Design a protein around this nucleic acid. Structure first.
Lengths: 63, 190, 133
RNA sequence: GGGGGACCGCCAGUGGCGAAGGCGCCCGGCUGGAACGGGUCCGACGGUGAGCGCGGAAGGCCAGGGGAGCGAACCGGAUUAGAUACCCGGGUAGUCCUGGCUGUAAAGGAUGCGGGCUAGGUGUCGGGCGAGCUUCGAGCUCGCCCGGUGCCGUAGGGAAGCCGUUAAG
RNA sequence: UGGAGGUGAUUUAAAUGC
């Protein structure tokens, strides 16, 4: 890693735009849990190992 | 003892309920009616491909004898030490897969299958290959007749159907029917 | 005799293979009738020659005249040995019997690994430093 | 053909798990630990640990139940100069189960625990990641990373054997 | 090229000497 030369996680941010309601959500590239859309009740991502596996096609802007 | 030989009777094996009267098997014995349950081993020359090739040794049992003619059912299968040692390898796995069967005919049948694993990553998918056998088998027994269901298993048909499903899960190699044993005969109504 | 269609008889031959003795024992295909039983210490006078190959050809030749006497011309050989008690590996009568059948003229079908081999453990004798020499 | 008790070869690995003793048929329920990605929460709560407390193979002991094979003692044979043995044939306690006691070992890695620092290489197990392959399952492989488990070896240490990012620096 | 296991093992070779 870089524990003595400043450890920075692997992370990033990405704007996810829902395909069922057009709802714009901020999502941590590593979903630990099931993230639920706040105006669909859908599942955007499912938590597995490392980076949450995104369920099916949902739009993405990478920050 | 001190048979002329003339206290020696002869019978002949006709073994159906997997095929027709397989003429193969000839029986000498001393007195009348000391074989009525005696067990005969055969390679089976009915299908000269697989049933002669990789299916060496099946046990058949004379349930009855009539007019001096032996009527023989499927009692069992067993493979030789030849088979089981040969196939197995290291840094992989060998698996074994029971199921206590009930077919709709009123026969129960104990199977043990044996598959050999594709190399690394031994895991819970092993027992899930186990699970996908006992699930599929139960369902084929309930649907199929028993006499048929003892032709299929002994043939490679079962080893073949098992593989298709189980290669989706976690790819296998060298899957078979190691042994089969007739759990319960009687009927659906005794 | 109730009419025979094949005109060939078959007698499976169990071969029990010890380093203390050799036993050859051919029966009918069922196994329910014993034509003949002949070992390697009727042939001889002494314990040392009880096994060897030479008893394990002669034993397998006296029997072979009585199987010819019934009609048994084809023979399957089922090689086996004491497995749980001792070591499974066959002794000097295994290469011997098959040579004793090719000379007798009885045909040789299947030759078979059917020796008792436990799927498991049972404690034999011999411990601390196992059996000692 | 029937009955009984023990155990689970190959699998099986230079493999895994466990604090340790230790642990291995398959299936399910209950349950301990552990890895990793994200540090999301607490905000020094830490280390070690005399006394103290707890777990601890086999053997032995206690009470009850069980007993195939095996087998101290023991009973025969051989061997042998003699044999209280090696080898062979019988054989009780015990070995198994339940409850309790006992608390020992070359209980070893003969290496107390915790933190930081100090060339590397390779194999391997599990987890992550970027790809190619795909039977579309991380199934077959390449590399970086994290945790563990071996071997080889630079600097150094050592009396030497050896140890050497799993330290004996 | 050097290291670790798993099991055959071999009785045909005799006690002692200040």
């Amino acid at each position: 890693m870089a524990k003595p030369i400043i450890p920075m996680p692997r992370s990033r941010f990405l704007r996810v735009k829902c395909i069922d309601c057009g709802n714009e959500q901020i999502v941590f590239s590593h979903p630990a849990t099931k993230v639920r859309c706040l105006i669909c009740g859908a599942t955007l991502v499912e938590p597995t190992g490392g980076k949450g596996i995104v369920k099916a096609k949902i739009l993405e802007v990478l920050e | 003892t001190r048979d002329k030989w003339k206290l020696k009777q002869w019978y002949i094996i006709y073994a159906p309920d997997f095929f027709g009267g397989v003429e193969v098997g000839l029986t000498p014995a001393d007195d009348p009616e000391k074989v009525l349950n005696r067990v005969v081993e055969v390679t089976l020359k009915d299908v000269t491909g697989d049933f002669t090739k990789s299916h060496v040794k099946l046990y058949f049992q004379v349930y009855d004898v009539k007019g001096q003619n032996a009527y023989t059912k499927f009692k069992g299968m067993k493979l030789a030490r030849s088979y089981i040692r040969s196939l197995v390898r290291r840094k992989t796995t060998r698996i074994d897969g029971i199921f206590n069967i009930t077919t709709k005919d009123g026969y129960k049948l104990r199977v043990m299958a044996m598959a050999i694993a594709m190399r690394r990553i031994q895991t819970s998918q092993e027992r899930a290959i186990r699970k996908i056998m006992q699930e599929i088998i139960y369902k084929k027994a309930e649907e199929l007749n028993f006499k048929d269901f003892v032709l299929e298993s002994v043939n490679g048909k079962i080893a073949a159907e098992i593989a298709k499903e189980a290669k989706k899960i976690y790819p296998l190699r060298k899957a078979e029917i190691r042994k089969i044993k007739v759990l319960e005969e009687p009927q659906v109504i005794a | 005799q109730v009419n025979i269609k094949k005109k060939e008889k078959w007698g499976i031959a169990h071969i029990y293979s010890s380093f203390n003795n050799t036993i050859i024992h051919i029966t009918d295909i069922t196994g329910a009738e014993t034509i003949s039983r002949w070992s390697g210490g009727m042939v001889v006078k002494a314990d040392r020659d009880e096994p060897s190959p030479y008893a394990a050809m002669l034993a397998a030749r006296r029997a072979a005249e009585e199987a010819l006497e019934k009609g048994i011309v084809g023979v399957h050989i089922r090689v086996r040995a004491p497995g749980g008690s001792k070591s499974k590996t066959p002794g000097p009568g295994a290469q011997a019997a098959i040579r004793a059948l090719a000379r007798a003229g009885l045909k040789i079908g299947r030759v078979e690994d059917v020796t008792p081999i436990p799927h498991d453990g049972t404690r034999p004798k011999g411990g601390r430093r196992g059996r000692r020499v």
